[PDB]
Structure 1
């Protein structure tokens, strides 16, 4: 298991990164410091997570301390839905750069295919409670992303939560200049994504798996929901390998040639989650984990099901 995967821009991306959604701002600085101290070289960020400044403090300290060189880090962020308008994309990227205290991102993603009305609110609502869309075509948003590469703000651009038809739309864009390097999508044993993953990989697009542990801290969790970390079948595979269930859940996407970004703010777990380069799941283990698919989503963007570009009506 090599530690990085080659992207279609010629750069190498670490296959394990630290997630930061829900990481409290008073804890995420230490989380990122610990992560870098124990070997992480890839941090997954987003403006909408509201903690990029605090992530940046950690990155900057570790650069200043010479624990890691900038060229060795792979920092990812994402353009929020309210910045799809072509004239807003650069400023959104620049704000993220300023908060993260960087002069470039390694990868910048369109966070969701759904554009929203610009403004202070991340989910602008009409008086009846529906999200208010933007009329900016995603192809125009993509062109604006391409400009970021050409201005040196980002090394690579990509997409997130795009279904296969939406990926195809980008790939078929008239005058396409840079292909998406990555599609970041939810992926774990309850949402295995075989169809979308094969499609992306066949086009040379690297897939990053988010919520690999099933996001037990997701805000809308219900007590009766399925639980990957508590699934006795997954626990059994872990016990066989003398690893934790989380470690199996992280190793699983790695062996599918995916990048994976487990989130933690707990120092012991941050370290545990990185200790996944010392064992191998068998083909049987892999197919067994795949068999647990139930098409269950942590992130269904339920408030936007009426949005024209809602990604999850299509089969994949």
Structure 2
């Protein structure tokens, strides 16, 4: 699905549109403001993805402000933030959003996501010590997030890093189902299982770490590079276009102006079926972001391995 032009977009269940390409901001650092302004004003991005836990929201805010002061309406932008683990209790949801909106210098978010489906204690360590991973009242948290929508502070709500079982648990109790499920997706980790479950429920999927992140960057993968040279495009452009053809929005992160400009030029051309199949053919070995260092305590639990974080669905 698409919108057409570099204004390509997907449609959420609420009728609101999400631009197909967004700017990621994890580890964007003290360049964040510049990258956000450049991406929006010069490269024509209309979607920014951030989070409180990234520590860059104030910077994103200054960037968004500068971009809008140059004659772009707030309505045209799509801003996503995320509710962190330590704030996953009903009475912490609203204060967390207000802080995010204040740092971003906004009055509403377009999308507010559960960052991870795990509650952490205040002052939790990495890895977490005994009793620092707490019990999650998912139903109560989600009810409060529905209230944010009702008040108009958030236009849509959703989740990240979910399993099929956790999705079913949420879908049982929810009045407003999740608009978006944001997941690690790239060649080498398709996660078709979660994608199919989201497709069934009409939930839109955003591919995070679409280039394999910093840790396992795929821009010098032999197969990706072969396709890139064949089509006269960059490896990044191929990786991102591959995702759009699967039907997921993408949020590639870069702090370099030229890469920011490149990453959105993924419309008006396609990856042929043979090349698409070859990239899908890369085996799903391992994920870059396991959540092990955030939630796994091997000795005391309650989560003693990475497979327990993903409900044994790998």
1:70 aligns with 2:45: no
Distance 1:293 1:153 in 2: 41
| 1:215 counterpart (194, 213, 216) | 213
**Which residue pairs with 1:94 in the alignment?**
98
Q: Does the CA-based 8 Å contact 1:124-1:131 persist in structure 2? A: no
- Aligned position for 1:206: 204
Structure 2: how far apart are the matches of 1:131 and 1:41?
Answer: 41
**Aligned mate of 1:247, from 227, 237, 243:** 237
Return the alpha-carbon distance in structure 1 between the equivalents of residues 126 and 190 of structure 2. Answer: 32
Given that 1:192 and 1:295 are in contact with CA atoms closer than 8 Å, whether structure 2 keeps it comes out as no
Name 1:167's counterpart in structure 2: 167
1:237 aligned partner: 227
Match runs of 1:158-197 below 5 Å? 158-173=158-173, 176-197=174-195
Tell me the CA shift for residue 105 of structure 1. 0.3
Structure-2 residue corresponding to 1:30: 34
In structure 1, stretches of 5+ residues that fail to align are none
Shift of 1:279: 1.6
Q: Is the 8 A contact 1:116 1:124 kept in 2?
A: no
Q: Number of residues paired by the alignment?
A: 300
- Return the alpha-carbon distance in structure 1 between the equivalents of residues 130 and 264 of structure 2: 40
TM-score by length of 2: 0.91
Checking the alignment, whether the CA contact within 8 Å between 1:111 and 1:160 is kept in structure 2 is yes
1:26-175 to structure 2, matched below 5 A, reads 26-37=30-41, 38-66=43-71, 68-117=72-121, 119=122, 121=123, 123-124=124-125, 129-130=129-130, 132-173=132-173
* Aligned counterparts of 1:310 and 1:9: Cα–Cα separation in 2: 33
- Which residue number in structure 2 is paired with residue 300 of structure 1? 290
TM-score of the superposed pair, with normalisation by structure 1: 0.91
CA RMSD of aligned residues (A): 1.7
Unaligned 5+ residue runs, structure 2? none
Residues 296 and 314 of structure 1: is their aligned pair in 2 closer, same or farther, counting only changes over 3 Å? same
